[PDB]
Symmetry: D2
Subunit: 119 residues, 4 copies
């Protein structure tokens, strides 16, 4: 357990799917967000990242949003909770595209996400 492959959901209802993990820790997959900053139609978006291949692995990944000019990165660690269920504790940075360097200071949001298996 704490295999990162497969499907996960966060408390927002977003879906993270990790398709494969390589021996050097590299992984690829897709992200489907339940929420967004604008009203454009949300589309499945690709991700790439890395995990440690340790007990309780740390990891990070980037999502290249297919429907906006934003990028989000997450980093976190996997643990088993009290019930022995896998949980990914993460923090994220959401970069929005600014028109000019003078507005750069406005361009980065932060938050936490908690991912668990689909019940």
């Amino acid at each position: 357990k704490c295999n990162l492959q497969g499907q996960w959901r966060n408390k927002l209802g977003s879906n993270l799917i990790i398709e494969s993990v390589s021996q050097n820790g590299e992984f690829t997959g897709t992200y489907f967000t339940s929420v967004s900053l604008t009203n454009s139609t949300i589309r499945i978006s690709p991700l790439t990242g890395y995990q440690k291949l340790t007990e309780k692995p740390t990891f990070g990944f980037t999502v290249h949003w297919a429907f906006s000019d934003s990028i989000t990165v997450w980093t976190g660690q996997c643990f088993l909770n009290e019930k022995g269920e896998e949980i990914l504790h993460t923090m994220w940075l959401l970069r929005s595209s600014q028109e000019k360097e003078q507005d750069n200071w406005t361009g980065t949001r932060v938050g936490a996400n908690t991912f668990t298996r689909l019940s």
Copy 2:
């Protein structure tokens, strides 16, 4: 120049960021050589993977898979041309350190800014 991220970059800490040819979909890989680290372990060159947007003044994000520790760092940011026409990467980062227990998770994520320019 028009913020194609390919090439050598340096931040104010003196870390070296090297980005390879950006793929048609914006995906890139590269290497990171940090000038600073959390402990006394010898710093080794580390791989990175990420994406950039394909628009003017691109947003981007990437993950560095540290070769010498159990940590992971992610950056996200946006490239602008400064006042001198010179390119500049404005970034924020999250550094995840590996914790031994789920109860210590709250301690595991550092945050900062980095500013990268061409050498």
Copy 3:
């Protein structure tokens, strides 16, 4: 509801007490953390901050830890959940004291906290 006065707890088990709120939004109180970075004895610590006096108020405060050289700031907003119970959604920055400016980059942690009334 969303009066900030009185006692609150977060998921770590920490206790936030807001003693009074003034007409200009200023508030004072104490914080008792259930967790810390070191092994020194945790002691009740003072806080000062401000809230908006609006529906669903935003707020921020600083805790002057009495038992370490750290400082933490929180900012967030109060809402009523589905049950009609008050909830404070917050993000925090924990600054630890560094010995030298060269290590400044290591000195700031980030996370989320969720505060509710004692049940």
Copy 4:
């Protein structure tokens, strides 16, 4: 100088930070005049309250209660003497914007760094 925070400070955005006499317990108040804001509303001088540590190279934190918007910003950081003996405040900040609904909470917190020096 020894990082007593009393006085006038400026950051790279050009915002003005003014801190009054620090009390015996480290508490301070002051005023903040930002050079930049999220919307087109006219910027007004805004009050702040916070604390500094009483040790060499003090950590500190404060909250600004914006007089012209429903937002709140908190900063935390540490004062060092740079290489030129000149004092410098290294900070990170969280800017909370007021959301209309609990469901939009994830959008409500921006993050950045600020660097303050004496005028």
